[PDB]
Each structure stands twice: as structure tokens, then as C-alpha cells.
Scaffold this active site. Structure first.
Site, PDB file in Angstrom:
ATOM      1  CG  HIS A   6      10.832   4.147  54.989  1.00 44.29           C
ATOM      2  ND1 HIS A   6      10.844   5.447  54.419  1.00 44.29           N
ATOM      3  CD2 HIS A   6      10.124   3.347  54.291  1.00 44.29           C
ATOM      4  CE1 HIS A   6      10.029   5.514  53.563  1.00 44.29           C
ATOM      5  NE2 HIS A   6       9.552   4.263  53.184  1.00 44.29           N
ATOM      6  CG  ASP A   7      10.517  -0.535  55.435  1.00 44.62           C
ATOM      7  OD1 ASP A   7      10.582  -1.481  56.246  1.00 44.62           O
ATOM      8  OD2 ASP A   7       9.701   0.391  55.640  1.00 44.62           O
ATOM      9  N   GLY A  49      13.819   4.481  50.088  1.00 51.91           N
ATOM     10  CA  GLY A  49      13.224   3.592  50.759  1.00 51.91           C
ATOM     11  C   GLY A  49      12.903   2.294  50.150  1.00 51.91           C
TER      12      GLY A  49
END
Ligand SMILES: CNC(=O)CN(Cc1ccc(-n2cncn2)cc1)C(=O)CSc1ccccc1Cl
Ligand SMILES: CNC(=O)CN(Cc1ccc(-n2cncn2)cc1)C(=O)CSc1ccccc1Cl
Ligand SMILES: CNC(=O)CN(Cc1ccc(-n2cncn2)cc1)C(=O)CSc1ccccc1Cl
Lengths: 258, 258, 257
Positions: A121-122, A139
């Protein structure tokens, strides 16, 4: 033959350009958007909200756009954005973002992401990068242009991987990797600079030498990071290529009032 | 009842022996040949030109015969050859060769390749080998008979893994592993010999002892590799088993004129 | 209906009324699935396997497969999974072998992340987290609340203690006592998982007692026998320290010398 296999599942709310190909037993979930000339293999799972650009190739057993399992994320509508001319090999996982950062996992253009790699994520990937088999970004990882992560390279949350930098295989990276630097081992250690990479981009021979001296200033001369930045100031004004290196170190190291 | 699931896809130009089994949602691509008694599980992707021998078992989520993504390869018709009585577990990737070597990735007989292992372009595996979960051969890797690579062992391009040799888990191998030798760590270091392996093959007790002395000559006595080879000459003429060891070191070490 | 028409359900499988199964999934012979569980697409279940209630299993997972260990000769061994577990994409879980307990077992509220491997005869407790590509070779016992960071490898027969924590790319070859943090290949003990104790709301006196316990075992030149003796007082005073002592106790029979 049609371009979308009848054995695939396409959500009503997905938006595919005219000449997209989708293999059998693939799922294109709600709110997935796929650009001109992209090819989805068989056995692929796409989930949204996801935007995929033009002329991508995504191979079998990949799950692209899935939610992170991080207990931080509570089902909010976060995004994944993929650019143009990327290749995503078999079994790759790419997760969408979280509201606690920018709500978006983003990938640029001309990247090669090899089998079983994970993009948490991200994370943000630039252009012309290569993530080799089983590379894992935990992440919030930023990978700048032309980086190469050798196989089974692991990167902790929040690390920045610098432009043209290179990790050896089985590297475990816990801090930023400055531009051009080569790192090896678990935990990762700086060894040298990615001269092979500079050769391919056709850097001048004066610039290559300047970057070797820059490496020595930061790593081989007992300087603190503050003292090194000061020493690099001259060399960074002389060479755009050294400025990239200085800027990657600069933006890694606020520190605390002592 | 037919042995080929109606939900599978078989290319017109594929050639399957009479009693081959293929599970649902598997693809047997153009120019794939499959021998007597082989079983393809569900969710398998075969691609050609590929020849698979007799009595193989290939499990779900495997991609066998895919092109390497190496930017070296430009779409030429290279081969993959698999022998008899192999087991390929879930998620394994095996790539076909490149014109820059022999144009062929090759696997022998009675091998066990466990989940998520990767066999890179132009690699050559012998017989009776075991590649444990997530073992990765980067390319042009030669693995000789009876070798065991523990889980998450990574092997750099061009390395030779010797007969009966053994890698510990998470090994990162960058140079040849002589026959019988055990190696551990990242980077891999030689520790001992695979006596367990010798026991299973029923080696004589005199041969086992000779191989331990051979280890000591090469590794524990300050000999250069040239001096060690000379010392091993007697022992290699006395024991076929030691000759295998000497020959693996011989063929690893041309060097440069000094 | 809740079972995709594109899925395959063996006649001898037993599904509770409100189980969901995605397209192109196989629920093999002798698989039992409890109330409220959701099987994603492209999943392979094999038996004899018992899956409890409110589980989520994601695509490309092979759950209940035979080990390839040449030890196993096709006997009817089991896999048991409890309640409220999440098994992410590509996970492999193998059933047991007759040479141990004939059963691979997983408790409740566990999170097993992508591409993790759970080898034959392993036992997982409750509230554990196995991060991407964690691999238990076999006969591994993981006690409650443990966290194994990504690409953690565990050799056969190791015990991972309650609340213990491995750093990423750890290669574990011996038991990890409860609460302990380990790093590297080969794994080394560094400290205790204080973050974990914070989340469970341990008392501040108990946290301090556990730090002293770490020092007794690791930083004071004690043999393991001498450490156990020293810990006896502190283990009677604090349930939390007793967990730590008990993890070390049960790691170290030794041999008559
Ligand atoms: C060719 N060089 C190596 O294989 C060294 N390498 C870096 C590397 C690798 C590939 C590329 N490119 C591929 N297409 C274009 N560039 C560039 C650098 C590794 O990651 C070794 S490990 C490994 C390698 C391959 C599979 C599994 C594993 Cl584990
Ligand atoms: C049984 N012995 C071990 O499991 C030790 N070992 C080498 C090894 C492994 C397997 C075999 N065989 C299997 N069939 C016959 N032999 C032999 C030696 C490891 O790979 C440990 S790691 C690991 C183990 C299993 C899964 C994931 C991981 Cl990471
Ligand atoms: C956010 N924390 C980290 O990612 C640090 N960490 C341990 C860890 C990770 C996650 C959790 N949780 C997630 N939901 C609840 N807990 C807890 C501890 C790692 O394993 C890094 S490596 C890694 C991580 C993820 C994917 C691949 C890999 Cl390689």
C-alpha cells in the site's frame, strides 16, 4: 476470436478501451479502468478503484488492486494507478493505498515487475525500474527512476530507493538508499555505486568520476552526514548527476535538535 | 469420460500421449508435447516450444515454458525440455532458453521442485535433485545429480551446483558449489560435506572418509586451488566419488594468466 | 446462490448453509467448511480438512495439499483451521504426517499473508500474524500473538513463543522464547517485543519484570539451567514471566552429561 475471452468476468462498471485483451478466467472488478493496447493474461484478478494505462502486459496469477490486510485500513475507497508500457509478471501482488498517506499506490511507465513481487500500500514507483522476482515493498516505499532491485530484495515501510540505485539479491533494506548506490545483505550495507547503470545512460566520464568521489565523501572518509552534505555542495553545483545524489541524502536526514 | 477436463484449453498443435491427464482451467499452448502418464493439475499454464516426458506431476498455478523477461531475449523460438518422473509443485515458474546460450532450458528425471521455485532461462538440472520452496536459479545455472537446495536458496547466473551438494536455507550462492559440499548464508560459505546424502546412496565408509579428507585439503589447509587439485589427484584415482569432487573444482577455476 | 456455478464442489464435501465460494475454486473430497466462511476465486481446497467459521481465503491458495516430503506415503492425515482467520493470496498449507500427530492445526483470529507456507504438522495458536512469504518447514509450533515479519523462515521442530517477533528475512533454527525479538540469518535475539506488550495492556511492573528476565537469560553469562533457577521467583510473581520461563523450560531437555 474476440479480444475479451468469453470465459472472463467483466464488471458492468469497468471501463476498457476498444482494443484491450483479457484472457480466460480473469476478473476485471468494479471501477477498474484499462487503457489502449493493454493485455491481461488468463487467471488475473483486477480490483478497483484502479486505473491502468496503455500498452501494459499483466501475466497469470497476479492480484492487482487488492486491499492491504494492514489492520490500519478499514475499507475506504483508495486508489491504484499504473502508467504506460509496464510489464507485470506472474503472481505479482499490488495493493491499493490507505487514507493515512495519499490514498494511492502509484506506478509510472516502462517498469518491469518480475514474478511474485509485492508492492505494498501507498508505494510509489517511477519509470524504467526493475523489480526482480520476489522483491517486496512493505508499504509507503518510493522507488525513483531506473532503480534495480535484485531478487528477493525486501524494503521496510517508508524507505526511499534512489534513482539508478541497485540492491543485491536477498537484500533487506531498512533505511534510504541514496541515488546510484549499490547495497547488499541483511541488513543492507552500501558497497559502491552502480557504474553499469551510468554506462547505459551514457553519463560522461567526468560525471562518473565525480560520483565515485561523492560516494567516498559520504561513506569512506569519517564524515557525519551533515559534514558530507557540506562537502558535496561544490561537486553538486558542477554536475547535475551529483546533485541527484546529494538531494537523495538531503531528503533522508532531518535529524533532531541536539 | 475423458482424462482431459472439458474446461481445459488444448492448442490444436499440442501433442499429448494417450493417457495424459489435464485438470480444469489449464492451458496447454502451441507446440507443447506431453509424454505418457503425465498429470497436469488445474490452473496450469504450459507454453512452448516445450517437451515434457513421462510420468510427471505438475501442480496448480505453475507457469511452465514462459518466455524470460530478460531484455536479452527478443522472441526467438527457444525450447524447454523436461524428462521423466518429475514433480513440480504449486506456483513454480520455468522459463525457456535464450539464443545467447544453448536455446534450451533442460530438466532431467526424478526431480522434485517445490512450491514457488523459479528456474531461469538456460538452466540445466540433472536427476534426483530437490529444489525446496522458493529456490531461484537466476539463469544459466547447472545443477548436477542429487543436489538439494534448501528453501529460499538463490543462485546467481552461471553458477554450477555440484552433485550431492547441499545449500542451507536462505543461502545466496554466487560461485560454484563443489560436489558434496554444504554451504550456508548470504553470501554463501562452505561448511562441511553432505554426509547424510552419502549415507542414503550407500557410499562405502572408506569413500566417505576420503571425501572428508578431500574437503580438508581444499578448504582447511591453506592450499591454493591449484595446490589442492594436485593433492587430490591420488585420492581421485582411488575413489570414483572423490573424482566427482575433484572434477567439480577443476571445472570451476580456469582463472587468468598471472 | 452463494456458490459460484463455475466452482467445483466434491459430493463428499460438507458446507454450512451460508458459505460463499468464488468462481474456479475447488472444494475437494472430505473438506468441511463452517458458517460464514468465504472462499475466493481460484482456490484449491483438499482434504481431510476442517475449516471453521467466518474465515476469508483468497485467490491462488492451495489449502490441504499433501506435503511432498518423501516421509509421507499417502495416509489420510488432517488439516484443522479454526474461526475468524484470514488467508491471503497464494498461501500453501499442508496436512500432517503419521510420524507426528497426523494433523496440521491453526487456531483463531490469525492473519496469514500472501505466499506464506505452513508445512506439515505445524501448529498455530490464536492472534498470530505471518507476513508475506513466511515459511514454516514443518512441525513448527507458533504460540499466541506471535508476529513473523516477511520472508521469515523457520526450520523443522522450532517453537515460536507467545508475543515473540521475528525481523524480516529472519532464518530461525532454534526456539524463540516468548516475547523475544530475533533478527538475521542466522537469527539472533536482540530484545523483547515491548510494542506487543503495550497493545495487550500489560502492567508497567510486568513489562519491567520481563526486561529483567531477558537480561537474566541473555546478558549475564548464565547457562540456561542457571537462568531458569533465577527466573523461578519472578515467574511466581508474574503470569507474564511464567509464560517466558515456560517457553525456555520446554526448549532445553539436553542429555545426561
Ligand atoms: C541478469 N542479472 C541477474 O540475474 C542479477 N540480478 C539482477 C538483475 C536481474 C535481471 C535484470 N534484468 C532482466 N531483464 C533486464 N534486466 C537486471 C538485473 C538478480 O536479481 C540476481 S537474482 C535473480 C534473477 C532472476 C530471477 C530470480 C533471481 Cl533470484
Ligand atoms: C525435511 N528437511 C527440511 O525441511 C530441511 N531443509 C532441507 C530439505 C527440505 C526438504 C527435503 N525433502 C523433501 N522431501 C525429501 N527431502 C530435504 C531437505 C529445508 O529446506 C528447510 S526450509 C523449508 C522446508 C520446507 C518448506 C519450506 C521451507 Cl523454507
Ligand atoms: C506494518 N508493519 C510492517 O510491515 C513491518 N513488518 C512486520 C509487520 C507487518 C505487518 C503487520 N500487520 C499488518 N496488519 C496488522 N499487522 C505487523 C507487523 C514486516 O514484516 C515488514 S516486511 C513485510 C510486510 C508486509 C508484506 C511483505 C513484507 Cl516483506
Amino acid at each position: 476470436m474476440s479480444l475479451i475471452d468469453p470465459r472472463a468476468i467483466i464488471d458492468p462498471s469497468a471501463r476498457l478501451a476498444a482494443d484491450v485483451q483479457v484472457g480466460p478466467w480473469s476478473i476485471v472488478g468494479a471501477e477498474v479502468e484499462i487503457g489502449e493496447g493493454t493485455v491481461i493474461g488468463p487467471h488475473v484478478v483486477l480490483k478497483g478503484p484502479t486505473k491502468i494505462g496503455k500498452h501494459n502486459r499483466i501475466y497469470q496469477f497476479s492480484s492487482v488492486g487488492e486491499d492491504t490486510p494492514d489492520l490500519k485500513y478499514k475499507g475506504e475507497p483508495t486508489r491504484l494507478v499504473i502508467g504506460d508500457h509496464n510489464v507485470i509478471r506472474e503472481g505479482v501482488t499490488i495493493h491499493r493505498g490507505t487514507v493515512q498517506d495519499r490514498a494511492e499506490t502509484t506506478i509510472g511507465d516502462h517498469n518491469l515487475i518480475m514474478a511474485y513481487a509485492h508492492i505494498g500500500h501507498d508505494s510509489v514507483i517511477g519509470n524504467h525500474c526493475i523489480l526482480v522476482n520476489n522483491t517486496a515493498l512493505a508499504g509507503h516505499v518510493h522507488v525513483d527512476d531506473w532503480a534495480i532491485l535484485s531478487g528477493y530484495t525486501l524494503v521496510h515501510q517508508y524507505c526511499r530507493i534512489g534513482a539508478h540505485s541497485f540492491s543485491g539479491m536477498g537484500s533487506a533494506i531498512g533505511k534510504d538508499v541514496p541515488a546510484y548506490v549499490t547495497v547488499f545483505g541483511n541488513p543492507a550495507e552500501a558497497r559502491s555505486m552502480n557504474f553499469e547503470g551510468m554506462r547505459r545512460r551514457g553519463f560522461s566520464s567526468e560525471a562518473i568520476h565525480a560520483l565515485r568521489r561523492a560516494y567516498k565523501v559520504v561513506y569512506r572518509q569519517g564524515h557525519t552526514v551533515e559534514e558530507a552534505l557540506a562537502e558535496l555542495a561544490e561537486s553538486a553545483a558542477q554536475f547535475p548527476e551529483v546533485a541527484v545524489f546529494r538531494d537523495s541524502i538531503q531528503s533522508a536526514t532531518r535529524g533532531i535538535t541536539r
